[PDB]
Design a protein around this ligand. Sequence first.
Ligand SMILES: [Mg+2]
Ligand SMILES: [Mg+2]
Ligand SMILES: [Mg+2]
Ligand SMILES: [Mg+2]
Ligand SMILES: [Mg+2]
Ligand SMILES: [Zn+2]
Lengths: 151, 63, 37, 144, 129
Amino acid sequence: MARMHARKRGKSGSKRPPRTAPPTWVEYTAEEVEGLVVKLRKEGYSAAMIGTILRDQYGIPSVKLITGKKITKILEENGLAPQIPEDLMALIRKAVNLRKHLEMHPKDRHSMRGLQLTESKIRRLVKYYRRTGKLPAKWRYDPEQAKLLVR
Amino acid sequence: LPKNLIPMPKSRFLRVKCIDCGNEQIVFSNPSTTVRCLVCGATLVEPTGGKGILKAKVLEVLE
Amino acid sequence: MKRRPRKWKKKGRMRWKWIKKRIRRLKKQRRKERGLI
Amino acid sequence: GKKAPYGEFAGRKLKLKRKKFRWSDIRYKRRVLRLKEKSDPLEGAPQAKGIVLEKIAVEAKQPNSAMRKAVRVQLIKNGKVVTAFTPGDGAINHIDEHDEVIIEGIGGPKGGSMGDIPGIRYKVVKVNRVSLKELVKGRKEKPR
Amino acid sequence: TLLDPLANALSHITNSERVGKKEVYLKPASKLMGEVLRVMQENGYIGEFEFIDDGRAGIYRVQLIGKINKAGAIKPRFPVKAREYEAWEKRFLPAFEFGILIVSTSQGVMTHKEAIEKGIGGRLIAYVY
RNA sequence: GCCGCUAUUAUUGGGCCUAAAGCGUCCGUAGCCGGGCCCGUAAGUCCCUGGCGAAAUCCCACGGCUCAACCGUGGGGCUUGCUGGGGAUACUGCGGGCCUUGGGACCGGGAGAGGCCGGGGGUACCCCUGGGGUAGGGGUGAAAUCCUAUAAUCCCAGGGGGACCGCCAGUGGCGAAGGCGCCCGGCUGGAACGGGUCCGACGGUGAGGGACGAAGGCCAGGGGAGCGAACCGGAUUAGAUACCCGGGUAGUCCUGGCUGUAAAGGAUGCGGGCUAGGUGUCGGGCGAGCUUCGAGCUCGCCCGGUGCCGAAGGGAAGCCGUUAAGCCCG
Ligand SMILES: [Mg+2]
Ligand SMILES: [Mg+2]
Ligand SMILES: [Mg+2]
Ligand SMILES: [Mg+2]
Ligand SMILES: [Mg+2]
Ligand SMILES: [Zn+2]
């Protein structure tokens, strides 16, 4: 899914099997699963990393299957969900680090293009999240404000 | 009908026990993180590009 | 310039590079006698 | 790819593109900008009247060998000189100078030249109010 | 990107019929694909269709019987009053009652024949002959 | 002259590798196109009905001038339609909610001449110095210009200089394209694979607009070995403003800017689905076997790239042919 700026037909990904009900081999209930989610967010892990750890260590496939809820739903219930969304945050951190690189390296135009594409993605997601309310309407990407944000 | 209808995982969840504590623990065969025993801190599977390399499963199951 | 591969062919033609160069010399003369002399 | 706008709510851009490429149609362009009317000495007419200035002859293109007779003619509505071909065999002898002559199109593909006559667009039809065909076939002698 | 699973389904059927396949699979299923297949079964162009269910939008397994020459979507889903089917037939079909134009109406998804006998128009979405 | 002919304006219904024609490449604003389920609304849409859309003109029948044309009676149509209500709700739209297949984020082990910056090297070439050794060297189709007896070419030991990174090196790889090859370190971009990770349609295309963009050229400042437009000489030739030879300025290199062109070519715009495959090769993964137990070798399978061939199919043909120039959706 290099699509969107590279147009390679990559198919790497997950293959969730159709599951109307949770697996019987699973030990944990919805409640303790939620507790683990909250524990790991306090340990400082993003939701993606939380699902990864619960898949690899605790053998939990699809917190959604188990609890009926999503990880970010659990986080916002326990008052721990991130202020701005994670994917946007990640892009912004990338862009800031790259801004720094490019100030010390002005002739790296290929990395400059990578920055341009990164900020394009940012703008797209900002548009969508303004439209859906996950950001204020007046929110807008800016490099310096984003630097303060990350920091 | 075969191999693209209902694309199904090749990975498996599998039950292992550590050599040190002996606690049975479910894990994933294709981990992105080094999996540690919940009791001892022992690595049960070390991550790779694909199927993780398994330590400490001498009594094993797979679901 | 806008160019034409058709013009780049040579079946009944002079070479396009040189046609082009002639055109540009003419244009230069005209520009020259237009604005200042 | 599949052509431009095919959507149900794309009629605007569709109309626009068809107009854009009608202007690549040269017939439409001539009709709509009225280029013929601007460059025509006959001023959009099927016929015209003119004064014969001189009688001349024109060489057929390449393969044919002949001297097609003609006349330089000054048209009255605008004072403009055009050359007209005199069909027939002794037509150029039936025609004289300072004579009033009627000027049709010669036929020809794009309202233009015809046959082995390279650059003549017009025919003589009447001479001092008498048809050149009848003058040539002998009947209906000329007034002046 | 993906746009109109229905057109994709119909083109798949068309190409598979050209090559003599007995069964096709239509992957981004829809209630509309299902209604169109219901109609195509009833008018005898396909055989038997069944909805397979994944966790995704679902698949249709469709057993053919060699009775399709051209099946396609009328994609500008054209509004059609109850007295214009003659013209749309002449555009999309080869003879006077040969194939079937599928029409979405307020009273369901129907053929233009049933629409005519009900005196109701709608929107054209597909043809099959 | 208009229509037709003309599918030579193409909504129906055209084409863009080689015939006219894919922007050099990318990014993105409007616009247009938009995955699946549920609920609602009922704006488009459909049905029914009220009021209007003059008459003439058009179609039809019937009547009157002998028939007809013409005229009248009546039925219908025409006017792009507009409007008042009622009903339906599949599709579209609008609103709300759910989803995860498309896309984005993340993680992991790998790959790669992706880029930038620094350092360290490799021959080769040219100049200077010193030693040797004397009579030619060079170049050509053949010669000459030129260098050389102040010691040349050749050989040897040192020093300096600027460019450039051979063989390995491939229908190889990376990159949007342009383009990118000595090694080492640092910063950095993007992709593939694996993934019961997260988000939850966030997507496509993109008018206009912006960014990048070979060589060459220009401004300024440096550097300048080799090559070398212009120029200068030697030949050749009927001529020779050239091809050949000897030199040689700009330039080629660096810094910062402008220029913004190319057979910038896959002469093939981008996305998505379908339509036999075979055989290579790169990368990742899986499974087996072998092993000198090697980031190893061989076989098979999956994904993604890159090639050849090829039935059907397509096409004017050449040729294309699951990396379409095929069918469909934009
Ligand atoms: Mg034409
Ligand atoms: Mg054509
Ligand atoms: Mg061409
Ligand atoms: Mg009327
Ligand atoms: Mg072939
Ligand atoms: Zn343990």
